[PDB]
Design a binder for this molecule. Structure first.
Ligand SMILES: [Fe+3]
Ligand SMILES: [Fe+3]
Lengths: 237, 234
C-alpha cells in the first residue's frame, strides 16, 4: 500500500533477436510509452496496451537497430495518436527527434534523454525522472556491452558514454538493456560498474578487446538498418 | 517505506522457456530461489555470490516435466542451502511444505498456497506483502498449465486459481514458471478478466482442457524421475 501509484512496467522478450521491449505507463492517467518495439510483435504489443486501458503516446527507439525491424512505424497506425521517436544523431526517420537533455513526458513521469553513443552515434539512454530505472539500449548490456565494429561504432566513445552517463547514476538504479543473450532480465549500476568484465577495464584495455572479438556481420544488418532508417518501412509482401 | 525494498531477479531459460526467480533481503543478505534449472545452476550460484547473498532455500513450485531442477546441484555449490518442494508432489527434498506454510528469509516470507491441478503437488508462493505471487504452472500469463499428465485434474486447477490466486488483490503481480509468448509478468486483475480459459465456466473449462490433443513433452520421461529425486538422473 504505497502512497503513490507505482509506475506500470512490462518487459517483453523477442526470443530470436533476444530483444527486450519495454512498456512504461502512468496507471492513473493511463498514458504510456513503448521502448524498442519489434515489428513482428507489434500487434501483440498493441493488444496489451488496449487490454491495460492505456493510451500510447510515443513509440521510442534507443537507437537504429541492426538485428530486427522496429515496430514503431507500424504502431503509428495500430494505435492512432502514437508518435515515433528516435535520436537525431541516428539520422533515421521518425515523427519526433530527440537529443541529449530532452524529456519524454507521460502522465506524471518522464524519460530523460542521455546521449550514450558508441555502439552507434545515435544511441541514447532513457532514465526515468526518479533515477530508479535506466534503459540503456545496446550501450550497456548485462555483464557486457554492444559491439562497436559496425554502424560507425567507436569503442573509445562507448567506454566514455557508459562511464560518464550511466555509471554516474545511483548504484541502486536498475539497468534494462535492449538485449540479453544469457537469460538475464535486469541489472543495476552498482553491479555493472563493479562487475562488468569489459567496462571495469581501463579505456585502453577496453578498446583492444572490442577490436579482437572478430564476430561476424549479423544476418539481418543489410535488411534491418535501412528499414529502421525509414521508421520500419520495407518492401511489402 | 524505510526498510529496503525486496531484491528480485527473473532469469529465463530459452529452450525450456522456464522462469527462475531469485528473491533476497538486501539488509539480511538472505535469499531464496524459485524453480532453478540445472543447466543454469552455476549461473545462478555465481549471481548469488556476486550480489553478496546467502541462499537459504532452493524452492520448486511443483515436479517439473519440462526440465531438470537445479535444486540438487545448488546444495553442493552453496552449502547450507536446502531444497524445498510440496509434500503432495511425492518428490524428494530436504524440506516439505503444504498449504499455510511460510518460507522465511530475512524480514520477508513466502506464504505457501496449495494450488493443485496441473499436478497434485503444485503450490503458489505469495509474498507476505501480497504484491507478488509465483504461480508455477497453475496460472500462466493468459493461460495455464496442461492438465492431461502428472495425474492432473482440470476441475481442481480451476478451483485452485479461483480460490487461491484470483482472491489476491487485483494489483498483485503474477510471475509464472513459464511463458511461450515473450511476456514476463502479469497481474491478478488481468487474468481475472482476460485469461481466455479461466474466465470460462468451470464446466466449460473442464471440457476444452481435454480437447487440446497435444503431444506429451519430450523431456518428461527423463525430467520427472530426476526431479522426484532432487535432480539425480538415471
Ligand atoms: Fe544494436
Ligand atoms: Fe509444469
Amino acid at each position: 500500500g504505497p502512497v503513490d501509484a507505482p509506475i506500470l512496467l512490462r518487459q517483453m522478450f523477442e526470443p530470436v533477436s533476444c530483444t527486450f521491449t519495454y512498456l512504461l505507463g502512468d496507471r492513473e492517467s493511463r498514458e504510456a510509452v513503448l521502448i524498442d518495439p519489434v515489428l513482428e510483435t507489434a500487434p501483440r504489443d498493441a493488444q496489451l496496451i488496449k487490454e491495460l486501458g492505456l493510451r500510447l503516446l510515443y513509440a521510442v527507439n534507443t537507437h537504429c537497430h541492426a538485428d530486427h525491424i522496429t515496430g514503431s512505424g507500424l504502431l503509428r497506425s495500430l494505435l492512432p495518436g502514437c508518435q515515433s521517436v528516435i535520436s537525431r544523431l541516428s539520422g533515421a526517420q521518425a515523427d519526433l527527434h530527440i537529443e541529449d537533455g530532452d524529456s519524454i513526458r507521460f502522465g506524471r513521469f518522464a524519460l530523460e534523454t542521455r546521449a550514450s553513443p558508441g555502439h552507434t552515434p545515435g544511441c541514447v539512454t532513457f532514465v526515468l525522472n526518479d533515477h530508479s530505472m535506466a534503459f540503456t539500449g545496446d550501450a550497456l548490456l548485462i555483464r557486457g556491452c554492444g559491439r562497436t565494429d559496425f554502424q560507425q561504432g567507436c569503442a573509445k566513445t562507448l567506454y566514455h558514454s557508459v562511464h560518464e552517463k550511466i555509471f554516474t547514476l545511483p548504484g541502486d538504479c536498475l539497468i534494462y538493456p535492449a538485449h540479453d543473450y544469457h537469460g538475464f532480465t535486469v541489472s543495476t549500476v552498482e553491479e555493472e560498474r563493479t562487475l562488468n568484465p569489459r567496462l571495469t577495464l581501463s579505456c585502453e584495455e577496453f578498446v583492444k578487446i572490442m577490436g579482437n572479438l572478430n564476430l561476424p556481420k549479423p544476418q539481418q544488418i543489410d535488411f534491418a538498418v535501412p528499414a529502421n532508417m525509414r521508421c520500419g518501412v520495407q518492401t511489402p509482401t
